[model samples]
Target: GTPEVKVASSEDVDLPCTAPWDPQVPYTVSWVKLLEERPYSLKIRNTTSSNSGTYRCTLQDPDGQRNLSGKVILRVT
Candidate 1:
């Protein structure tokens, strides 16, 4: 299950996505929000109510061998 993250409007927010364990080699990390994907973590500066939504984190191996993902729900008030 995913957890909800609450923040105030206009506040800077960081949605973190850390790997569960070290891959010990080359890997990639990414974040997805509203179907839009970005690098590493999601950073919102001066967040607004519209920023409330679901966020996802993805970790994958250099090859297509291993992949992991997680989700977070964010609410701006």
Candidate 2:
């Protein structure tokens, strides 16, 4: 089973998907990030019914054999 969170419509949501790794190691980040500095977090504006779904995030450490993944469930009512 996974975790679930309920929120109201037309609200701004910051989905938590932060994964702290070795900053010294080289890696690439790609996600629906809300803030430019915090790549681990995602910012969604004016959330609607379509936003009621699980959001997944992935990170890859190219220099080493390291990979990470996570999920965030959201429901808009």
Candidate 3:
């Protein structure tokens, strides 16, 4: 699935995603900065161009048996 991302230099950006996943199954959402090997969340506050890069969202199930991956690109001006 294609994830939609909206970003503005002077404002916050919300990167949206849908699991279409099962509610009964516990899942964890995580964001990672590929370049720096850091992690973030869905809501990025006070965004800047410097923050631009490739990000990956990893969803882990409660049992840690299954994992889902999603990618996003953010560019600010």
Candidate 4:
């Protein structure tokens, strides 16, 4: 399943994703500005219009196994 997010200007939003498959395993979460040249991770600080874009989260392990958790679209005013 995919995740969706809607946020107003100056509002705070927390995009959350979970891996129920293996709780003990660590997953890497990242945010990407589709309009930009690269991808990045979301910070704890407040978000702005620049943060609006597509975000992808990938889960990886030492066994060379990887999976995509989901993607989110952020709309900023």
Q: Write one digit per residue (lDDT tens) for candidate 3, span 1-77.
A: 45546577878876643444565666788777679622224777899888777777787887888887777777766
* Over 4 Å off, model 3: 1-6, 18-24, 36-41
Show model 4 residue runs off by greater than 4 Å.
Answer: 18-21, 36-41
TM-scores of the candidates are: 0.74, 0.67, 0.71, 0.56
lDDT of 2 by residue, 1-77 (tens): 55566889999887766455666765575564222254566678898998888776667888646777666688888
* Candidate 4, lDDT over the whole model: 0.57
Ranking by lDDT: 1, 2, 3, 4
C-alpha local distance difference test of each model? 0.78, 0.69, 0.68, 0.57
Winning model by TM-score: 1
Candidate 2: what lDDT? 0.69
* Order by TM-score, highest first: 1, 3, 2, 4
**Tens-digit lDDT string for candidate 4 (1-71):** 55567677677766554333366665555444455512223542466787777765555554656755556
Q: Give me candidate 3's TM-score against the actual structure.
A: 0.71
Give one digit per residue, the lDDT tens place, for model 1 in 3-76.
88899999998886644636466557777785554346678899999989988888888887998877888999
Instruction: Compute the lDDT of residue 34 as modeled in candidate 1.
Output: 59
